[PDB]
């Protein structure tokens, strides 16, 4: 055949740290359906926000928002535990159905997005061009977010571990850990990946006894 219908740009959702994660790649023939299981970004979350995105950039804010919805009623649990199945299905008339369902609670939400939604032909060409011209900066942003998400989880794990080790943790180590936490939290806000990793290292250095308690 010399012609067929595709979805012209990648579709997916925003994940922890403001990244676009793709569920359906650009130029995939329609109809088509793809699912992926996600979890929660922090301990004790009872909801997730599904922000639907069209485009080829790694920063979620640089793609086109198609809409969003919340999935609520998740039993609060340790980060990474809930299994949230997200499904994107585009039918033959180009209408996109996105759903998310929490396996444990059985709660589900969805949205329907009309086929005329999203970017037009010139914006599609520009999105492809801009992704190409900014490829190196986007890979660097993805690397930074990976390191921020690890630093963020180490910040929360450490505070939890300080808690679990009440008085067992010497007073002076608590003080040193707390200062290193502050420094890590500051580095996470910046955009220098090595600086964040360096603060995680410095925190590991004062956490030796904290680790022994575990």
């Amino acid at each position: 055949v010399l012609l067929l219908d595709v979805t012209p740009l990648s579709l997916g959702i925003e994940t922890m740290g403001g990244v676009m994660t793709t569920l359906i790649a650009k130029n995939t023939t329609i109809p088509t359906k793809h699912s992926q299981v996600f979890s929660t970004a922090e301990d004790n979350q009872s909801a997730v926000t599904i922000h639907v995105l069209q485009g080829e950039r790694k920063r979620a804010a640089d793609n086109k928002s198609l809409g969003q919805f919340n999935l609520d009623g998740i039993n609060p649990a340790p980060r990474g535990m809930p299994q949230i199945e997200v499904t994107f299905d585009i039918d033959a008339d180009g209408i996109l159905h996105v759903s998310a369902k929490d396996k444990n609670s059985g709660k589900e939400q969805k949205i329907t997005i009309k086929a005329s939604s999203g970017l037009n032909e010139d914006e599609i060409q520009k999105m492809v061009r801009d992704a190409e011209a900014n490829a190196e900066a986007d890979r660097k942003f993805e690397e930074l977010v990976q390191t921020r998400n690890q630093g963020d989880h180490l910040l929360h794990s450490t505070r939890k571990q300080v808690e679990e080790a009440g008085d067992k943790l010497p007073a002076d180590d608590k003080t040193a850990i707390e200062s290193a936490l502050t420094a890590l939290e500051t580095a996470l806000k910046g955009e220098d990946k090595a600086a964040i990793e360096a603060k995680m290292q410095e925190l590991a250095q004062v956490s030796q006894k904290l680790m022994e308690i575990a």
Partner: peptide, 7 residues
């Protein structure tokens, strides 16, 4: 690893 969603 598994990707994560905020609240």
């Amino acid at each position: 690893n598994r990707l994560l969603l905020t609240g």
